[PDB]
A paper describes a structure:
Cobalamin-independent methionine synthase (MetE) catalyzes the transfer of a methyl group from methyltetrahydrofolate to L-homocysteine (Hcy) without using an intermediate methyl carrier. Crystallographic analyses of MetE from T. maritima reveal an unusual dual-barrel structure in which the active site lies between the tops of the two (βα)8 barrels. The fold of the N-terminal barrel confirms that it has evolved from the C-terminal polypeptide by gene duplication; comparisons of the barrels provide an intriguing example of homologous domain evolution in which binding sites are obliterated.
In the zinc-replete complexes of MetE with folate that provide resting-state structures of the zinc site, the metal–ligand cluster adopts tetrahedral geometry. The observed Zn–S bond lengths in our structure are 2.30 Å, Zn–N is 2.07 Å, and Zn–O is 2.14 Å, in good agreement with the EXAFS measurements. Folate is bound by conserved residues in the N-terminal barrel (aqua) and the C-terminal barrel (yellow) with the N5-CH3 facing away from the zinc, at a distance of almost 14 Å. Glu583 makes a bidentate interaction with the 2-NH2 and N3 groups of CH3-H4folate, an arrangement found in several other folate-binding sites. In the binary complexes with MetE that we report here, the pterin ring of the folate is stacked against Trp539, Lys104 hydrogen bonds to O4, and the folate N5 is hydrogen bonded to a water molecule. The orientation of bound folate in the binary complexes does not allow transfer of the methyl group to Hcy.
Author numbering: 0 to 733
Write the structure that this text describes.
């Protein structure tokens, strides 16, 4: 007998029923009851999928917005500003709206959670959702195992006084009070018959201190009386010996995303006092695996229980109706529903119930020898611009003849319902491409004119033809495929359909040329080329595992570089390469950062390798540059724009203190996440802070980020004040 486990199965339903229900409720289209009944169908849909494939069925997985927020509600972490928790009404105020909690990335994944704000040092059992959901399935005669966020990881994901609660001294006191509530929750589940509880402590995979592990042993020592199974994933655990020594009867490890866990089990063994749960089915990638090989690994591991490596909610629900993918691909793929089915076949195999497992051995599958070699043979000169910055700067400044404190925008412009509708019609064939492109050139023509009237120095074409900064390029790249229903939960009710890099990436034809070229031909001021970095394109989509990441990134980098060259040949003087994944795709363990940035930097520069006369701009959304400034300094851009409105310029600190800094900085002086219009006096404060040490010739004035989420009547005013501020500054220093 091989006990099979599974967790994180998508909650969105096969037709985004979850999305429709959430939004129907917020609109007031359905009652809270109808909403609840809709959620209950999803519960049954999820539970029946588990029932048909694994032995342990999870409960408490259908979060109405976020499971970390759910955890916060359970332990009473509800900030004073929300008043008395009334229920769903209060819950959704914490999740969305003007008083909502902060939203941030859940580890190195594309899912986003809500950061709890701990205002009091004492926790209490406010609502026992684990017990609720448990009983619900019990009504249906289904025994389930509550899925919960462990106490350590909960605190690790939360903030106090706006700061991470990640230091042992910061957690100690809190942990004692907190564990108490978990103790109540667990004691109530066991009283009602709960036989097993799934605890998630993914934070165990972060670069922890021996001091953290003393705390962890402490916490779980107080919970040893309960039937707990601990899960860890996304990377190897920071201290193997300490972790397997925890007083828990069963431990789960991620044996897919890292090779460290295996080597440690091989070196130190595994305690015969507990049971190993081998997470051997990838939960972040969509590929079929040779189950024969996975089977031998399980035997090697000595485990008698299996499961997916990490949560399955990073994958689409099912591959069943994906019948329009490139030839041969579908046979190599496998989504959430298929992974579940993979654990069943693995279970039957190991138990000797079946002696036949599928082939799955794609190797020479969709490969372009010419392009693969064309990348592997790249000379050192491929990652370095012909001339150092100082020289490129003079050439560029003479070619652009820009005034002091020039102004510009980061990229996307608001897309009124009219352009939003037109894209729909086009997508549905309700319009002719010939007429669609004509509609775009119309929005572009209008945008260019509006920018000149306002007084901007460097213009952008608006990006009206782009919905997603990755999807747009992914759809024009060979070796990449797009699904029809592969929706993955990004956060709340927002879903993304990540592309699939299944083969050697190459760019068969110009991707943005017509739009840029057109916009430039409407004015004499410079218009920015708009490109997405290689790492970001890769990071937002799924990709082949049988080859090193860096290779795939370099392949995409090549494609992007060819585009940069076409832009130069076509006369574009400024090209921007937005690489938000630069820091987001970095390993969870900062200790593994040096290796990663080595090839991330290379990938960016290979793509950004433009002629010296071409000014390269790079936009970084990050709120702090202290921990990556050393890596950023190796990127060969000529201008970097940051978001300085929130910190009111204080974010420039990382740059001031970086001895030798000399590149231009686009100072974001307007928080585009707010509808308000910042005053000239407000933007001025920011620009004055940045001019405290850095030479005034380095400064560019621009908005924090893209404007696609704003309204034209908020943009115009703001842009106008921005230009005005530019003129005032330019008169005080010239
Ligand atoms: C991978 N994501 C990502 C990112 N930005 C960063 N920095 N990192 C990321 O990982 N931007 C896109 C996406 C997360 N953000 C979003 C934002 C909105 C929607 C959204 O509203 N999606 C629509 C469908 C949009 C369409 O028509 O394609 C939805 O209702 O699901 C999805 C994801
Ligand atoms: O080390 C991972 C941490 O920085 C966060 O991304 C966890 O969500
Ligand atoms: Zn940004």
């Amino acid at each position: 007998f091989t006990k099979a486990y599974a967790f994180g199965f998508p909650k969105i339903g096969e037709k985004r029923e979850f999305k429709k229900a959430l939004e129907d409720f917020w609109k007031g289209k359905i009652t809270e009851e109808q909403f609840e009944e809709e959620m209950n169908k999803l519960r049954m849909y999820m539970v029946e999928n588990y029932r048909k494939n694994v032995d342990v069925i999870p409960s408490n997985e259908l979060s109405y917005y976020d499971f970390v927020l759910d955890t916060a509600v359970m332990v009473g972490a509800v900030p004073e500003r929300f008043g008395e928790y009334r229920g769903l009404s209060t819950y959704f105020d914490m999740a969305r709206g003007g008083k909502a909690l902060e939203m941030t990335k859940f580890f190195n994944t594309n899912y986003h959670y809500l950061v709890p704000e701990i205002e009091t040092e004492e926790f209490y059992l406010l609502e026992n959702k684990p017990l609720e959901d448990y009983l619900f399935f019990k009504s249906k005669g289904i025994e389930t195992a509550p899925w919960v966020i462990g106490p350590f990881t909960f605190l690790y994901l939360s903030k106090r006084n706006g700061e991470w609660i990640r230091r042992p001294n910061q957690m100690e006191k809190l942990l004692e009070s907190l564990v108490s509530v978990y103790k109540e929750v667990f004691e109530k589940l066991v009283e009602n018959g709960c036989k097993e509880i799934l605890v998630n402590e993914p934070a165990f995979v972060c670069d922890l201190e021996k001091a953290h592990w003393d705390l962890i042993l402490n916490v779980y020592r107080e919970l040893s009386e309960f039937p707990l199974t601990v899960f860890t994933y996304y990377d190897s655990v920071s201290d193997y010996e300490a972790c397997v020594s925890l007083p828990v009867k069963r431990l789960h490890f991620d044996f897919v995303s890292n090779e460290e866990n295996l080597k440690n089990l091989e070196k130190h063994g595994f305690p015969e006092d507990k049971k190993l749960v081998a997470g051997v089915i990838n939960g972040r990638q969509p590929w079929k695996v040779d189950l024969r090989k996975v089977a031998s690994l399980v035997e090697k591991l000595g485990a008698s229980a299996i499961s997916n490596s990490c949560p399955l909610f990073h994958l689409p629900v099912t591959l069943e109706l994906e019948n329009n993918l490139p030839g041969g691909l579908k046979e190599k793929l496998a989504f959430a529903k298929e992974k579940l089915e993979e654990l069943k076949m693995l279970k039957d195999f190991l138990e000797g119930k079946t002696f036949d497992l599928p082939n799955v051995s794609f190797e020479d599958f969709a490969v372009d020898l010419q392009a693969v070699e064309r990348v592997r043979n790249l000379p050192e000169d491929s990652f370095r611009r012909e001339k150092e910055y100082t020289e490129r700067d003079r050439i560029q400044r003479e070619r652009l003849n820009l005034p002091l404190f020039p102004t510009t925008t980061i990229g996307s412009f608001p897309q009124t319902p009219e352009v939003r509708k037109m894209r729909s019609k086009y997508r549905k064939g309700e319009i002719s491409k010939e007429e669609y492109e004509a509609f775009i050139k119309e929005q572009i023509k209008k945008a260019i004119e509006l920018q000149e009237e306002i007084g901007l120095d460097v213009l952008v074409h608006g990006e009206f033809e782009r919905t997603d900064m990755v999807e747009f390029f992914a759809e024009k790249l060979n070796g990449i495929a797009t699904t029809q229903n592969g929706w993955v939960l990004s956060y709340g009710s927002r879903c993304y359909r990540p592309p699939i890099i299944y083969g050697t990436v190459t760019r068969p034809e110009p991707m943005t040329l017509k739009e840029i070229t057109y916009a430039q031909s409407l004015t004499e001021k410079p218009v920015k080329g708009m490109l997405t970095g290689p790492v970001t394109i890769m990071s937002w989509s799924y990709y082949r595992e049988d080859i090193p990441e860096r290779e795939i990134a370099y392949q995409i980098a090549l494609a992007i570089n060819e585009e940069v060259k076409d832009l130069e040949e076509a006369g574009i003087k400024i090209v921007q390469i937005d690489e938000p994944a630069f820091r987001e795709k970095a390993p969870i363990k900062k200790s593994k950062w040096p290796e990663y940035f080595e090839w991330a930097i290379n990938a960016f520069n290979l793509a950004a390798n433009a002629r010296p006369e071409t000014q390269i701009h790079a936009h970084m959304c990050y709120s702090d540059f202290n921990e990556i400034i050393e890596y950023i300094h190796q990127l060969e851009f000529d201008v970097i724009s940051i978001e300085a409105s929130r910190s009111k310029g204080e974010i420039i600190s990382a740059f001031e203190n970086f001895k030798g800094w000399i590149k231009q900085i686009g100072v974001g002086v307007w928080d585009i996440h707010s509808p308000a219009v910042p005053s000239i006096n407000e933007m001025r404060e920011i620009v004055e802070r940045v001019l405290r040490v850095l030479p005034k010739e380095l400064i560019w004035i621009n908005p924090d980020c893209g404007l696609k989420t704003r309204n034209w009547d908020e943009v115009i005013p703001s842009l106008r004040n921005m230009v005005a501020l530019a003129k005032e500054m330019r008169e005080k220093f010239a």
